[PDB]
Amino acid sequence: GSHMKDVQTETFSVAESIEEISKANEEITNQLLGISKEMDNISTRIESISAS
Amino acid sequence: VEEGTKLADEADEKLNSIVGAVERINEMLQNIAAAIEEQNAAVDEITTAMT
Structure with a gap:
């Protein structure tokens, strides 16, 4: 198989x-x-900022 | 005495009207003292919030 020596490199x-x-x-x-x-953490904190 | 008793009975009424009027000032001044206790509680609630 001549071109199988390239199909292994591929x-x-x-x-x-x-x-x-x-x-x-x-x-x-x-x-x-x-x-x-x-x-x-950002989501939780912007709820604490909304309550603040 | 006729015009001394006239001016003195008017100065009686105008001075017994002050003993109520400056007591009405005092009643309003105790009501701003009571409002200062709420401002101190409210600014302490705002300060822990801003911190």
Whole structure:
């Protein structure tokens, strides 16, 4: 298989890329949780400012 | 004595009218003293809020 010597170079590049995306979309999902909590802190505080 | 008793009976009425009138001033002044206790409670409520 002459061109399978290139199909490994291609499928290596996709396999190394997709595995970075797989932890990077977990790093983003973690950041979205931390933002959500901090917007809830802003939300909570603007209610205390409304009562003040 | 005719015009001494006339002016003195008018000075009686105009001075017994002061013993009520400056007591009516006093009654109003006790009512602004009572309002100062509310301003002190209210500014203490505003100060803990602004802090």
